[PDB]
Amino acid sequence: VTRTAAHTHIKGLGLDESGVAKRVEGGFVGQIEAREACGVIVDLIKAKKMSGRAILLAGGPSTGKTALALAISQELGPKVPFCPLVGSELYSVEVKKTETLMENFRRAIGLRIKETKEVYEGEVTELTPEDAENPLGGYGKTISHVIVGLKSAKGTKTLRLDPTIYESIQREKVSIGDVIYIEANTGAVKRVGRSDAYATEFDLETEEYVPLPKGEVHKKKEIVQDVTLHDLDVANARPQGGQDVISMMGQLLKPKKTEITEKLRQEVNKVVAKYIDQGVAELIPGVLFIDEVNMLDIEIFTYLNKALESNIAPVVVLASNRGMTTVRGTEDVISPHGVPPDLIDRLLIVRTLPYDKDEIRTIIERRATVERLQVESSALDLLATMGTETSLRYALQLLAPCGILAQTSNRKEIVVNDVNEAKLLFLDAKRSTKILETSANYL
Amino acid sequence: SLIAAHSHITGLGLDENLQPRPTSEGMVGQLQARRAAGVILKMVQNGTIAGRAVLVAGPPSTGKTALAMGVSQSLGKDVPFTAIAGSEIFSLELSKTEALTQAFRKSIGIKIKEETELIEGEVVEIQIDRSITGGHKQGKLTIKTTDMETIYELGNKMIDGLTKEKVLAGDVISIDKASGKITKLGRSFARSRDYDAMGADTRFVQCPEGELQKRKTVVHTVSLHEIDVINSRTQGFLALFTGDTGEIRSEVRDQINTKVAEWKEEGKAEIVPGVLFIDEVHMLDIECFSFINRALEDEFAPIVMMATNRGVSKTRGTNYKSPHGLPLDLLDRSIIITTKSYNEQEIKTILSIRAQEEEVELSSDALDLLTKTGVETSLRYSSNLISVAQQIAMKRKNNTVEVEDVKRAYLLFLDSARSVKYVQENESQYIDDQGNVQISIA
Amino acid sequence: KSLSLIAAHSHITGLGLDENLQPRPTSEGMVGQLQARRAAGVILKMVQNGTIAGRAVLVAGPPSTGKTALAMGVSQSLGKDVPFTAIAGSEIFSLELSKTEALTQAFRKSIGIKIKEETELIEGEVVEIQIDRSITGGHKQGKLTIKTTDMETIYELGNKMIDGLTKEKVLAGDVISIDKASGKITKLGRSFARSRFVQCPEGELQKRKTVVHTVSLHEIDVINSRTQGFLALFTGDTGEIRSEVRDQINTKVAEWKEEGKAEIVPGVLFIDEVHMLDIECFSFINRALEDEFAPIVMMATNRGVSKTRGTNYKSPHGLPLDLLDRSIIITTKSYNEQEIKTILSIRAQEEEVELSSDALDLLTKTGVETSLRYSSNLISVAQQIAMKRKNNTVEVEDVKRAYLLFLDSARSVKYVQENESQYIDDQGNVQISIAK
Amino acid sequence: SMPSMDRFITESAKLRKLDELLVKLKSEGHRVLIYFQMTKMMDLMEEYLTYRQYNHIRLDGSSKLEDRRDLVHDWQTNPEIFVFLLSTRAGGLGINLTAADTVIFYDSDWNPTIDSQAMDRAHRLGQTRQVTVYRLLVRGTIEERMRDRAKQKEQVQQVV
Amino acid sequence: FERADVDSPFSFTTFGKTTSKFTDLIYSSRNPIKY
Numbered sequence A: 001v002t003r004t005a006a007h008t009h010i011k012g013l014g015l016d017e018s019g020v021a022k023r024v025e026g027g028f029v030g031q032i033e034a035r036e037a038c039g040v041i042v043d044l045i046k047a048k049k050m051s052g053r054a055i056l057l058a059g060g061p062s063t064g065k066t067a068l069a070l071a072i073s074q075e076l077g078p079k080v081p082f083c084p085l086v087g088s089e090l091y092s093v094e095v096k097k098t099e100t101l102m103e104n105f106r107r108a109i110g111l112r113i114k115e116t117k118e119v120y121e122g123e124v125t126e127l128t129p130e131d132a133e134n135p136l137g138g139y140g141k142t143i144s145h146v147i148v149g150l151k152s153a154k155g156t157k158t159l160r161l162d163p164t165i166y167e168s169i170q171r172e173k174v175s176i177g178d179v180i181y182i183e184a185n186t187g188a189v190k191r192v193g194r195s196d197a198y199a200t201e202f203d204l205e206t207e208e209y210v211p212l213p214k215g216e217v218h219k220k221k222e223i224v225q226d227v228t229l230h231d232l233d234v235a236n237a238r239p240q241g242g243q244d245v246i247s248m249m250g251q252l253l254k255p256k257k258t259e260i261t262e263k264l265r266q267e268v269n270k271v272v273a274k275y276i277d278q279g280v281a282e283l284i285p286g287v288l289f290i291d292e293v294n295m296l297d298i299e300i301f302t303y304l305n306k307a308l309e310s311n312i313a314p315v316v317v318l319a320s321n322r323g324m325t326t327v328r329g330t331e332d333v334i335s336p337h338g339v340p341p342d343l344i345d346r347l348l349i350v351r352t353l354p355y356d357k358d359e360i361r362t363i364i365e366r367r368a369t370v371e372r373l374q375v376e377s378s379a380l381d382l383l384a385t386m387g388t389e390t391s392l393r394y395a396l397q398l399l400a401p402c403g404i405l406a407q408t409s410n411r412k413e414i415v416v417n418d419v420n421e422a423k424l425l426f427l428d429a430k431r432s433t434k435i436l437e438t439s440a441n442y443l
Numbered sequence B: 001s002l003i004a005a006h007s008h009i010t011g012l013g014l015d016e017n018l019q020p021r022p023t024s025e026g027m028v029g030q031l032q033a034r035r036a037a038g039v040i041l042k043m044v045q046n047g048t049i050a051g052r053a054v055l056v057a058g059p060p061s062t063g064k065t066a067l068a069m070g071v072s073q074s075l076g077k078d079v080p081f082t083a084i085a086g087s088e089i090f091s092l093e094l095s096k097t098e099a100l101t102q103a104f105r106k107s108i109g110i111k112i113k114e115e116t117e118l119i120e121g122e123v124v125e126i127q128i129d130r131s132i133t134g135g136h137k138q139g140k141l142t143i144k145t146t147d148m149e150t151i152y153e154l155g156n157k158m159i160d161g162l163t164k165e166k167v168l169a170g171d172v173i174s175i176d177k178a179s180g181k182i183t184k185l186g187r188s189f190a191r192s193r194d195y196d197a198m199g200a201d202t203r204f205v206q207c208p209e210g211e212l213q214k215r216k217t218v219v220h221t222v223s224l225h226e227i228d229v230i231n232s233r234t235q236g237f238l239a240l241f242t243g244d245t246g247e248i249r250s251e252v253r254d255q256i257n258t259k260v261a262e263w264k265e266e267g268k269a270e271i272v273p274g275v276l277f278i279d280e281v282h283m284l285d286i287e288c289f290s291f292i293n294r295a296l297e298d299e300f301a302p303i304v305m306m307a308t309n310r311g312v313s314k315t316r317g318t319n320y321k322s323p324h325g326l327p328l329d330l331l332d333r334s335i336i337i338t339t340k341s342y343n344e345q346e347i348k349t350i351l352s353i354r355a356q357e358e359e360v361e362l363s364s365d366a367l368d369l370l371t372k373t374g375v376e377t378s379l380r381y382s383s384n385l386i387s388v389a390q391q392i393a394m395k396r397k398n399n400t401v402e403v404e405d406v407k408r409a410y411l412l413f414l415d416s417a418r419s420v421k422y423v424q425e426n427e428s429q430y431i432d433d434q435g436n437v438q439i440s441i442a
Numbered sequence C: 001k002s003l004s005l006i007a008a009h010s011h012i013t014g015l016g017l018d019e020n021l022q023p024r025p026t027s028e029g030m031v032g033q034l035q036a037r038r039a040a041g042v043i044l045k046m047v048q049n050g051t052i053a054g055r056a057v058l059v060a061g062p063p064s065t066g067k068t069a070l071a072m073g074v075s076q077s078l079g080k081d082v083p084f085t086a087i088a089g090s091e092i093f094s095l096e097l098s099k100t101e102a103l104t105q106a107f108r109k110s111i112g113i114k115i116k117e118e119t120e121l122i123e124g125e126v127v128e129i130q131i132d133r134s135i136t137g138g139h140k141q142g143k144l145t146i147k148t149t150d151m152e153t154i155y156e157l158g159n160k161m162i163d164g165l166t167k168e169k170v171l172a173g174d175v176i177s178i179d180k181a182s183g184k185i186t187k188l189g190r191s192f193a194r195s196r197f198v199q200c201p202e203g204e205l206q207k208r209k210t211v212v213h214t215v216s217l218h219e220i221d222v223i224n225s226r227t228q229g230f231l232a233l234f235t236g237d238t239g240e241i242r243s244e245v246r247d248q249i250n251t252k253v254a255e256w257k258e259e260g261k262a263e264i265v266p267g268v269l270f271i272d273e274v275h276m277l278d279i280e281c282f283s284f285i286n287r288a289l290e291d292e293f294a295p296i297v298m299m300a301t302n303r304g305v306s307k308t309r310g311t312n313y314k315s316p317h318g319l320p321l322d323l324l325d326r327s328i329i330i331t332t333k334s335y336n337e338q339e340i341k342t343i344l345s346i347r348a349q350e351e352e353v354e355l356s357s358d359a360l361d362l363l364t365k366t367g368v369e370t371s372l373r374y375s376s377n378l379i380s381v382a383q384q385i386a387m388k389r390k391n392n393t394v395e396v397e398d399v400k401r402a403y404l405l406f407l408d409s410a411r412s413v414k415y416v417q418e419n420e421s422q423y424i425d426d427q428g429n430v431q432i433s434i435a436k
Numbered sequence D: 001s002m003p004s005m006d007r008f009i010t011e012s013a014k015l016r017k018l019d020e021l022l023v024k025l026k027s028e029g030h031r032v033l034i035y036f037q038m039t040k041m042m043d044l045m046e047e048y049l050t051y052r053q054y055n056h057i058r059l060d061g062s063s064k065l066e067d068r069r070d071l072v073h074d075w076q077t078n079p080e081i082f083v084f085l086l087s088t089r090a091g092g093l094g095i096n097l098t099a100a101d102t103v104i105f106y107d108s109d110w111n112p113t114i115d116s117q118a119m120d121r122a123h124r125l126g127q128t129r130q131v132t133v134y135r136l137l138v139r140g141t142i143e144e145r146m147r148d149r150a151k152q153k154e155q156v157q158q159v160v
Numbered sequence E: 001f002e003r004a005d006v007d008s009p010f011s012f013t014t015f016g017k018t019t020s021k022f023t024d025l026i027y028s029s030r031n032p033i034k035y
Ligand SMILES: Nc1ncnc2c1ncn2[C@@H]1O[C@H](COP(=O)(O)OP(=O)(O)O)[C@@H](O)[C@H]1O
Pocket: A006, A007, A027, A028, A029, A030, A031, A060, A061, A062, A063, A064, A065, A066, A067, A068, A363
């Protein structure tokens, strides 16, 4: 019926109105201090005043570092932008890593804008172009004006096109008996389809049929749009949308990333400031999440030191699972969590703790409940002592072969013999390493 | 086609209770690995879960890629199976993360249901009106069957279809509305007056009768990666074949995911998960493993099967040794299938199956000698010797491989250990690691 | 304009100095560091005089001791209209530009040309537009009654003004500005007529205004190179601009300067974390600092006797000695208890946080124990913990709860060294299992 | 991109189930009355009917009095008319709907007496076939509470 | 209550808009960023 993949039993942090977390609610078990710290961070993000705050989730493997960030993302909701990222995404073969980090920084700041649209829409009744006096003069186009007749409900208008508008009229291949939609902001034309006032079944081009639009031909409407600053940056970097030559040829060329200069970002910032000053736009700071932050090298860390001190940058969350690991790109320095101390001095570190046996048992119970399976209590205890023996992830991932082997014997419950069979078929890292050490030819 | 290495494996050879037969579908031996592969096959066929990593580990010449090919054969059609090697990730146009994202997204199919109209009728009248420069084209088509008569209006693409493989007013054609296909079934009118050129020596066919227009529900499968490449830019369908899809942005993938969820909600399209198979996964950098560790946790993720023939060895991109050449983070979230070496009876049955696949008849004593050499040397050497022995047998004009042909093939073509012995006995003849060689025989 | 939420150096509005370049104990958001602030004031007077060029100043000291704060104060006290290019050390390792070309662009972005010009404009309020049109659109006639709060007039309009008024449709009641030479008509808005909203202009209709343009040398270098347009100033693909057009711009700028048509303004190029540059960058800077069209370069670093990148030896501040011969060095010092308390009080007033006195003493004690930035980061988390229990003033236990929840560097190192068996070491060995 | 017609149908589950049952109701070739409570409910249905290009007419409170004569006359004469959009108390007071049997009560839960008058309009003498009264509803909503109140009023007015 | 409307890209432009025998419309889109 539904699909589950390593998550989606987690819905949020699951706190009270005072920020005190429960023992088990919202898909989480334990981790009370980390969930309270993440709730404080979520409240700080919702305060919408701070710029460039950074926390780091420090812990071991399989302890719930990605789950806390996903719970933060679901606690904020789809209204606030959230940009997930891996540490290996910053190395591109098209542009430098500093520009990619700047791009992902600007991709986490949103904006909500109420925008006015001037529209001419209706059914085309007549389309008559008139010719120029000399068409082969070299300078000046073939035609001079085109007369179009638009008919809508309770209205009929006649328009005289600029030829520049007529090029975008003709490129979507409109004709007599066609419903169109002209947006006066950019000159873009949408061909809705044939009007249903005429015949229907006599066509051979799988078209759709639309009635006449309600209201007058000329309209002004209010569309509420959501956007990021990075969208404006890539719109002004590669200009498409106009009716001139350059914006027309920009749609056909291959798109490529470029180093967007700071001057364009300052101009976009000034225009956005003018927009919010008028009472039109509203600014939404967001979250940038970077998992496996130890893959970053020293140059990206040194640029992060500069980028966190700007007055635009959002809240950035990091994660790592290294104790005393040398920083990549350096040769001798050893720093905690693979993160250099000059950036460590600007972070807030949140510890994540391992679990006990009963916590592993109830996590396995919730995972078996979510994946729609029925597990016997003795099999649950065997899975719990297996999870304490080897790993939590190994006990979690062996539930579905247990379900398949229980289904193949025409049964719904999972029993001890099924768990023993799944133990015999699939191995873990420790038994595989013990096979590797006492091996003949690098088995 | 041609006889390949794994052309004899059609399926996995399993029962209805997932109990593997000792010899079925071209696979012998390896009972527990085939049982686990059948469990993985059932987990893929259910399609309920996503992002499970399976590792197949063992010594060389054991049956890892043979097991993967058996899984791919038992998978059936309309389920994608993206099989790549480890060295294909490194490119000069795409990053490692982008190439791995494309490899992940090539393994999820979207099954889309569409409605179409089929028209089969005798062509009566074709009127085509074109401009002077040939740009604007429109027209009318009067088509008939034995019972009705319909006049249709034509578009640009339909007239382009009619102009190619020209129809000449009296033929019988077929029309698909959703696909836009033109298929000339034949000719029924049998006109006497014919121009010297053209000439529809199309096979005679009766005029179709009954309803002119018929409705049909059709279905077709596309991949997620094709949707992103098509929606990436203006000419994405050319980039699907030229491979010029350089670093598709994330907003495209988010909008495609939202539209796929919308199509699932409206009942138009369904999602079929597939298998991504990485052969020789140990040839990957640590950044690729770090990306895989987060890409396996998403909803739109396939079942990832990796194959390794390595023991404890140095991980690429770092300076420490790891089990199977893989870091412990990726080894934590994976379940491992272990393959084991063969006996003489299994090797004899494998050589019998490979001799039956290459259509080479073998004697009993030649089979015993091949079994003995495949016990001493590797299995692949004695497998490769069969075609050479067959060619030697055809040179002496007898279509049955005897013992002396295998002896001559053993003498003519060398092993690894024998070649190592000959190199180590005559080290001065070859160029060593320091570049010193003795060419002169004085 | 210039939207900004709160920055780490947003409380600094300039160097606090008197007329004798003496530093006040607390002025314009900067406290402490008297000698460094006086030296930066002397550097500011060097920049404002503008009679010398190509002087390199190095700011070196311990981390979190007023270096970027000093650079931000110098940039704020410089004011507007003077170029200031603040880059990082890792920003020049590009994929489409070489390191020397990126350094040349960053050098030439900091020298400006000041050009004054005059233009005439018609800014007014449209009373009435009358348009007479023919059947075929051959001859158009136009009357425009337009006014200010001071005058009133009627204009006969030619055909191109009719076309320019039909496009960008001007109705009665609007306030518009017309340029006669170029034909650019801008709608400023609507007037105060209830029957956006702006004020009807005063004075003469035909005004003559002088505008001042400051154009960087890099902009003229991009424009004069014919292979790319001005859009490379925004898209960023300038792509290895040749030296011949740089020579032509360098000659023409001096030609304009001699004729009095333009003026030279120099700026400041700030390189934050200068130790991350390569040796080939330092060798380029050693010769690029001796040009006439060279700004004042301020470099900030915190390394002490480290390895120079691109070599195998160790050098002071991560910089080779030939570069350090060409520089004068300003040295910062660590802070006391009172200055840390004053900095934390300023940051408390900046983020609109109300603090009790004992909480401020606890923050000062944990600031002189661990770090300045750690106490500067706890002060906004403690406000949210205060707002969770519905009170405005942050008390002592509110700081203690945030101290308990959020760790620092030394405690994290202590806990990692205590439980290192649960983490990944350098060799990649970890233990995930709890038992045995 | 325009507002999609199928996205307008599929975003409402009541309209979704209505579109499912109309497929078999038109495949059998039947006569359908559909009731509504508001003007805006019948200001949205004919857009869905234009997708199906069904023969449909609408009677409401703002209709002129003479049109109610010839619309009923066309109902009792023409058999090719399919969809009858009706208000609550307009077509449910003494109107002859004798050749119709399938009534679709979209939200007829405001009072049981109006619904009683409504199904007295079609279930009348002269009907030649079986009458199936459909009642579609969203479960677990305020309609549950109002259906509780309506059932209570039904039992009260039926016993008394 | 809220009827779905035209899903269109946000237009980052300034043009000639009306402050409300034929009507002449002319392409007049410009960029808000000025050099
Ligand atoms: N408190 C918890 N409750 C339920 N599941 C948890 C909890 N903590 C961790 N998990 C599970 O453990 C797995 C590993 O957690 P994750 O944060 O993704 O990796 P890591 O902890 O290694 O960073 C996840 O799939 C998550 O579902």
